[PDB]
Amino acid sequence: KVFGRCELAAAMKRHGLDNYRGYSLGNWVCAAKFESNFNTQATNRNTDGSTDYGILQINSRWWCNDGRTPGSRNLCNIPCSALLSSDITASVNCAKKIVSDGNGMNAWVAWRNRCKGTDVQAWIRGCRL
Ligand SMILES: [Cl-]
Numbered sequence: 001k002v003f004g005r006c007e008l009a010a011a012m013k014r015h016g017l018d019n020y021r022g023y024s025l026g027n028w029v030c031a032a033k034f035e036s037n038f039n040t041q042a043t044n045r046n047t048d049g050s051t052d053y054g055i056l057q058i059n060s061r062w063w064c065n066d067g068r069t070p071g072s073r074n075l076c077n078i079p080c081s082a083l084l085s086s087d088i089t090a091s092v093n094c095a096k097k098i099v100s101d102g103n104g105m106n107a108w109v110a111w112r113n114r115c116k117g118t119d120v121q122a123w124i125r126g127c128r129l
Pocket residue numbers: 005033
């Protein structure tokens with residue numbers, strides 16, 4: 001599923017992301033934009049052999065199991081394929097663990113490089129949330 005901007009914002013809010021660990025809703029939508037372009041099916045291989053899955057490009061080295069990432073953990077206790085679903089519940093529950101891990105949203109390199117510090121409220125402008 002390719003979400004619309006406000007559509008994803010509403011979904012994220014419903015699932016308890018707005019101000020989760022103090023990150024406003026615009027932060028999460030901005031991260032999703034640059035990680036996946038709002039595409040639940042997005043996958044991208046990393047240089048280390050792990051792969052990133054779904055709207056928030058969650059990484060098989062720590063977070064999910066994809067069966068092909070040696071020496072890796074599955075801290076969200078989920079198959080990585082569950083992160084590609086039209087229903088974002090698994091992705092959000094797993095993001096909640098990630099953001100709680102100590103470095104906040106800096107875990108998402110695209111967030112640090114493209115969203116951090118910016119006017120992220122622009123990403124929810126116009127949405128009825
Ligand atoms: Cl957009």
